[PDB]
A = this chain, B = another copy of it.
Amino acid sequence: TEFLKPRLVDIEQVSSTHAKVTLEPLERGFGHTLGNALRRILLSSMPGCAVTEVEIDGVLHEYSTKEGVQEDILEILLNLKGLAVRVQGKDEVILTLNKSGIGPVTAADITHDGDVEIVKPQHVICHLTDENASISMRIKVQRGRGYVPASTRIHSEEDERPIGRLLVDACYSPVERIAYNVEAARVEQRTDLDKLVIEMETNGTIDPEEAIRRAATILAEQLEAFV
């Protein structure tokens, strides 16, 4: 008995967030094995770039606020949390955001650095009202995986942090939604077959492409003790 080996047919880009992926051909009773197994990695795991640390001038603690600003600190921590970011080379990076005047504060108001590529240039961070004040801040971005919040980070260190360096919980995991369809494949040889279509939605910090190849690697990586 000989095993068919499934492959990639076409990637259907719909947005920088959303993408379906069609796969054929898979033998009977395998669309349920992988599609499920793939998804379980794709949510749980997967290395997306996200926000971790921030410092701001004129602020002491997160529970206080800054003048000429509609939103609160925790609110701006909260808006930073759900950011979209990309990194090319090194793992940990230090950004500088400087905006002043009337109106909103979008990410495109950060200094466009080389390795730094932003996905949403109209995302909401913060608001300003009075036109004789501004905000300067050093933000820190990192590549990790899963969810290591601020809490588990206040008990695996002893060198101590300074005052002003606030902590956002890290949303390393990029994907926000995923499913998998099980349709009947019409190959021009055999009609018994199925094909696997995996729908996904994300923040664009990792491409729809790599994501799949990167997860099935992890899957196989675990299987390497049984060959």
Q: Which residues of A contact B (CB under 8 A)?
A: 1, 3, 5-8, 26-30, 32-34, 36-37, 40-41, 44-45, 47, 143-146, 212-213, 215-227
Contact = CB atoms under 8 A, between A and B. Distances in A.
A37 B212 CA distance: 18
B227 A1 contact: no
B224 A5 contact: yes
**Most chain B CB neighbours (cut-off 10 Å) among A7, A44, A143, A222:** A222
B36 A225 contact: no
Contact of A33 (B6, B41, B145): B41
A87 B33 CA distance: 29
Contacts of A217: 226-227
28 contacts: A1-B143, A1-B145, A3-B218, A3-B222, A5-B221, A5-B222, A6-B225, A8-B225, A8-B226, A26-B222, A28-B44, A29-B45, A30-B40, A30-B222, A32-B40, A33-B37, A33-B41, A33-B219, A34-B37, A36-B36, A36-B37, A213-B226, A216-B223, A216-B226, A219-B223, A220-B220, A220-B227, A223-B223
A220 B26 CA distance: 13
Copies of this chain per assembly? 2
A91 to B, nearest CB: 9
Contact of A220 (B44, B45, B223): B223
B40 A29 contact: yes
B222 A6 contact: yes
Closest 4 CB pairs of A and B: A216-B226, A29-B44, A33-B40, A7-B225
A223 to B, nearest CB: 5
